[PDB]
A paper describes a structure:
Here, we investigate the substrate specificities of two enzymes of the M64 metallopeptidase family, the IgA protease ThomasA from Thomasclavelia ramosa and BF3526 from Bacteroides fragilis. In contrast, X-ray crystal structures of BF3526 in complex with substrate and product peptides, combined with enzymology assays, show that this enzyme targets the N-terminus of pre-digested proteins, but does not act on intact IgA. These findings reveal divergent substrate recognition strategies between M64 family members, while providing new structural insights into their conserved catalytic mechanism. Despite containing a metalloprotease domain with a putative zinc-binding motif, ThomasA shares little sequence homology with M26 proteases. This multidomain protein (~130 kDa) harbors a zinc-binding HEXXHXXXGXXD motif within its predicted catalytic domain, a hallmark of zinc-dependent metalloproteinases. Structural comparison of ThomasA323-878 and BF3526-STPP crystal structures revealed a conserved overall architecture of the M64 peptidase domain.
Author numbering: 323 to 876
The structure:
């Protein structure tokens, strides 16, 4: 057949018998499409997506499939908070046969007896097939396309058996993640993280009934470093320190995530009846693909991604307001690790919740009652300690601050000190091959502000709890409208100054909070084109389908 995509930007590989023993892909041409390039590759996390089982005439489907899956992944926190700090490239790897036809494919993917997708070295006797990403595709991409333009060092068809891993370690520092999308409807998924031996890729299907959730799940194993919360077993020591989101420590005073206990749906429990593997929440995507990321996974994932960029200095989880009753306020309240205790906890939280979609639960019977504003804040600086001010007040329906019988406003303020992240260098820094141990509480502070509503509070129907989390300059980092905020879709398009579209680009779509002013320094180049101007930055995004246009010369 013929390519149904532009060939103007491409890379060429040389695959000898170790990577293509049958010769079917000895000298393949791989067209390169830019799904998103908001900044220089040196400042963003670079994601490279290749297609398995797409013929030359199916590359239009492959690009659209990558855009769909990537956009749906960017709707999950913590990815969403970094959506504009990814650069995404689609590499149109052509297979002779479609996957469903079962002939020759670019990556020799088979589905084993465990429904796992695996690059099969022994399918055609290509003994280094599953090293293709870090030894062939990666170095060619980093030399020709990546703004760093690192010249290839070692010949991938010549390197002798012995120290064949170290010369390719740099690949996974310039390319944050390799993703392989299989043109199929079968439901499978698998991540392969073993950087000491060069593996950092995952495989997911394009059209399964849960393709988008599977993509976000395997991306969390690969990029975020999260473990499966469905796994059995028993984390002994060393394994306890290694795991970001799993634990086997049963004393709530010693659990790594003690500071998060009682915050939203964080209640330690076993991942199954009679299991010694504990999770911080029974509703997380890393256990069941129908859920969102739990608070620990969001914290850990956010921290991991902060290592790969240089301009993120603080994590502020979405605060919550609850009636303070003393329930679930001390570590002893969390000693029961059964799933019954978790769901009883979530029911207690819902009964006391006064924020988000439960902001309406506030009523005039709240007089003389205590309310608690709570969130979790992670400092990203290993250098600068932070001080954040929490303000909370009772607000009437019309926006006025409620008062007591003396006319004193029902408001309270408390400043919290966020310590530095001293242990930062131990938490998947750029260049690490693995994670061994980290201090979960380094740079971490649970902040709780308890306010006693006076008994003489002049409450009216429709009153609500308002709050603000402010930084040292007074910027609002989160408020009582954050949880239910509307998000608007924004697209980045790439055009020449005359107005035509730049070939081999296909701008994707991500969401930002309504009213967001995008503040990004565009990359100086796009392929060999030089950046001129951008239309759409530094203005409030107030409509779905807003287009920001990057303009390039020639
Ligand atoms: Zn989780």
């Amino acid at each position: 057949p013929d390519w149904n995509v532009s060939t103007e930007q491409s890379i060429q590989l040389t695959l000898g018998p170790w990577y293509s023993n049958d010769g079917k892909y000895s000298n393949p041409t791989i067209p390169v499409y830019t799904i998103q390039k908001t900044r220089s590759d040196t400042e963003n996390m670079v994601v490279v997506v290749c297609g398995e089982g797409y013929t030359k005439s199916q590359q239009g489907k492959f690009i659209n499939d990558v855009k769909r899956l990537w956009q749906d992944a960017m709707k999950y926190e913590p990815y969403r908070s970094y959506a504009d700090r990814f650069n995404v490239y689609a590499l149109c790897t052509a297979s002779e046969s479609t996957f469903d036809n079962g002939g020759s494919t670019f990556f020799d993917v088979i589905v084993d007896k465990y429904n796992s997708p695996v690059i099969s070295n022994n399918l055609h006797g290509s003994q280094w097939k599953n090293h293709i990403f870090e030894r062939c595709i990666g170095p060619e991409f980093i030399e020709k396309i990546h703004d760093a333009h690192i010249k290839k060092k070692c010949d991938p068809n010549t390197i002798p058996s012995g120290s064949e891993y170290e010369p390719y370690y740099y690949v996974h520092d310039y390319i944050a993640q390799f993703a392989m999308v299989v043109n199929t409807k079968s439901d499978f998924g698998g991540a392969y993280n073993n950087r000491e031996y060069g593996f950092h890729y995952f495989i997911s299907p394009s059209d399964s009934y849960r393709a988008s959730k599977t993509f976000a799940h395997e991306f969390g194993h690969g990029l975020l470093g999260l473990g499966d919360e469905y796994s059995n077993g028993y984390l002994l020591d060393d394994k306890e320190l290694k795991s970001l989101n799993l634990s086997s420590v049963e004393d709530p005073e010693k659990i790594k995530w003690r500071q998060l206990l009682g915050f939203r749906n964080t209640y330690t429990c076993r991942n199954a009846y009679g299991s010694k593997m504990l999770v911080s929440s029974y509703e997380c995507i890393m256990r069941d693909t129908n859920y969102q990321f739990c608070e620990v996974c969001r914290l850990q994932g956010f921290k991991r991604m902060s290592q790969l960029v240089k301009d993120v200095d603080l994590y502020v989880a979405t605060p919550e307001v609850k009636e303070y009753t003393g329930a679930y306020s001390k570590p002893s309240d969390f000693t029961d690790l059964e799933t019954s205790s978790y769901y009883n906890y979530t029911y207690n939280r819902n009964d006391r919740l006064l924020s988000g979609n439960s902001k309406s639960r506030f009523n005039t019977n709240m007089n003389g009652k205590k309310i608690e504003l709570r969130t979790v804040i992670q400092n990203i600086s290993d250098k600068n300690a932070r001080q954040l001010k929490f303000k909370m007040w009772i607000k009437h329906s019309d926006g006025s601050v409620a008062t007591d019988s003396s006319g004193n406003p029902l408001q309270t303020v408390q400043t919290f000190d966020i310590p530095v992240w001293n242990d930062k260098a131990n938490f998947w820094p750029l260049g690490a091959l693995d994670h061994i141990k980290s201090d979960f509480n380094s740079g971490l502070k649970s902040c709780s502000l308890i306010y006693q509503i006076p008994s003489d509070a002049q409450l009216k129907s429709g009153d609500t709890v308002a709050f603000q989390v402010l930084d040292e300059n007074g910027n609002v980092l989160a408020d009582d409208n954050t949880e239910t905020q509307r998000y608007t879709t924004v697209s980045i398009q790439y055009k020449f100054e005359d107005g035509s579209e730049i070939p081999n680009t296909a701008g994707g779509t991500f969401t930002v909070p309504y009213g967001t002013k995008l503040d990004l320094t565009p990359a100086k180049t796009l392929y060999d084109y030089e950046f001129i101007k951008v239309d759409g930055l530094n203005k409030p995004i107030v409509s779905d389908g807003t287009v920001v246009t990057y303009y390039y010369k020639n």
